[PDB]
Design a protein around this nucleic acid. Sequence first.
RNA 1: UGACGGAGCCAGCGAGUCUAACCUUGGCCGAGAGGUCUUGGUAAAAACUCCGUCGU
Lengths: 97, 51, 24, 59, 93, 125, 253, 44
Amino acid sequence: SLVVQHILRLLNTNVDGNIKIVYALTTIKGVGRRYSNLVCKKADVDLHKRAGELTQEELERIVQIMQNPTHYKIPAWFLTLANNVESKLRDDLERLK
Amino acid sequence: IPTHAPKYEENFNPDKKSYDPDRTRSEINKMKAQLKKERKFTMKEIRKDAK
Amino acid sequence: VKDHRYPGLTPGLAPVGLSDEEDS
Amino acid sequence: IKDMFSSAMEVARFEGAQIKTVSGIRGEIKRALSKPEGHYRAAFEDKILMSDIVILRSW
Amino acid sequence: THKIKYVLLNCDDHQGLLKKMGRDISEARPDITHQCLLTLLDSPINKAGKLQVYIQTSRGILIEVNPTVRIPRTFKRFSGLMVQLLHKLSIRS
Amino acid sequence: AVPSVQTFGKKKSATAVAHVKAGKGLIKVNGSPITLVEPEILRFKVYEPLLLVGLDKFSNIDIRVRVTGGGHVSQVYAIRQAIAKGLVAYHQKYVDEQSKNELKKAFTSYDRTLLIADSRRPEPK
Amino acid sequence: NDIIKSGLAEKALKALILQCEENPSLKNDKDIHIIINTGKKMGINRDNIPRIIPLTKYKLFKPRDLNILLITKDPSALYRETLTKDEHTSELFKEIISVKNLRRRFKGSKLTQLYKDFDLVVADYRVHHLLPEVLGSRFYHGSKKLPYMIRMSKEVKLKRQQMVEKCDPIYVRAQLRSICKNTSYIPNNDNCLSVRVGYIQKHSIPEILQNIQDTINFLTDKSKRPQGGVIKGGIISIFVKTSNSTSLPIYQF
Amino acid sequence: RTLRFYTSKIDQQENKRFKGDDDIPYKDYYQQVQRGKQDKKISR
RNA sequence: UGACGGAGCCAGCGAGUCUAACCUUGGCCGAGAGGUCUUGGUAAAAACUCCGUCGU
């Protein structure tokens, strides 16, 4: 009878727990699908996990990766005239007349 | 039910052009229209004179 | 290393050394 | 054609004008092109080459 | 609507003008339409989300009134909104 | 010489040339088996002759179809028309005329376009 | 090593770096180039194939620093799959594209966008000669983004035999590391030559001077032919400049 | 943290929209080289 | 009745020794005219079918 086994804040961004970790972190500005995938791989967090399931240490590691990319060797690539014109047109108009 | 208020401009004049948040944006948009009108008129006049 | 089809290969092919192969 | 005029306004003044090439192929200034300024369309009695130079005679 | 600025034609405010358009001033009353919308939208049934209102203008214009709207209570502000609605063809929150 | 016949099917710009000869039941379109014809959704369309008269008749012949021009649908219709016409012509030339009549009757009963070209020539009004 | 010892080289680099800071028009200039006046015509027709000059002492760049575009033979399924899976090359390339897809997807103004996004372009040697038609003029004048030839695998071609198609990720990564760290040059049938030697705000003046001497030694050494030893008959003069700054002399014969 | 923080939220929640008859809201070496290059051109 | 990527695959017109950019940084040669190289910026079959991902 005894068996013992929604929202998170990362980089000042709210991420839904129901979304997968990679596509949940994509919502963060400056984080793409490929970049989120690489960060998850570096963090050794299984990509199949939902954002809610993540443990505290895994979130801390992800924050460390994201804030400090170069230390973990993340690739770098991831990281008035109109008045003159109108006056000229007016002058041309006067010259025409 | 949630209750929202309608957004409308008092003394609305559809012929009058829409109010713009940025004065510089309106002023340049005011003037690009003037340049286009003047350019089209003079081009019509020079063509007719040439003909 | 030469390829008859593309004579351009033998000039301007990146030199490879032991340091390059070794992982960072 | 290009380099004959500086702006489309000038071309409109010369629209319909008679022009020719060095080879002697006669043509006409049909219309001024919107982009870039000064470029214009012309029609010639026969196909011209890129090496040819078009001339407008004026006094 | 008609320009004098554009004003919602009213039976009392604009009598001489409506005479010029030739329409009889007996049937120039948008306040009645204002009156019904107030009691309909403020009725508890609307607060229960079981009521939506449509308006068929005499000219033949059909207007959809979202249940969420909060029309102005004063008639003057009500008139200012309709001239916006007929010309812009929509009103946003 | 090996007995052989040639026929054409046409649909808009698509033209198919079918060569039908004595053989062992080898149907190919553009050098590949008929089962690989695309689009798959219309594949049974090009199967329609083979099924309507039965695969037994084809067991003694080889058919080679080459298709050029037009789009997918018109190419499919050209292929089926060419196959039907080729089978009928081969049975005419190198088999009894009774079977020719049965083949023509079956094809015309199912879909006359298998034999006669479907040409939507303009008609002013 | 006389060039490094000569003080003329140091002062010019100090003047060049300083005036780039001062002059707004040179604000976008980041690379340092040396202009070499060979005494005699080289006699080599410009093949647009970069020639790598090994810089022993210092490394100009690492692969992780630059946007790298890889252009592969059609089909790219084997190369894309193998490179993207292998850990060494999983994150090495910004984009992997085939010749046919590159021609179809990118045309006209899109070619300009491709030019800006990528810092380095590399391509299979088999498809290199096709790129000038595809990439357009912008890539192939100036030599800033000129594609580099790389070999996917160590397999070789033998006449009357078919090459086995394989992708060796460690070999590709090794080549790219060499390309980035080592500078490159393109022969032309005229005296003038331009070679990148340094990057402003990354390389100190002593490092750039060493790179120049490495460039001079490799280009003058007859033993390094055909890649090196192209500068026959000595060097009349050498200058230094950025893309938009003028030639400041550092050596004159 | 403290209980009192929860009490404030609980009281705030009860207190926590137009209602009734409310109306809508109203309203130098480099310079030397450059000169030297030019001086050659004019001299020629 | 989406976006991204990959794969497969189907036309008919059309062939004048004629088809085609701009603005810069500098080396060398040349009496000049100009020639060559170097350099940065700007401008410039599809539908269809199958597969994989996200998700309204």
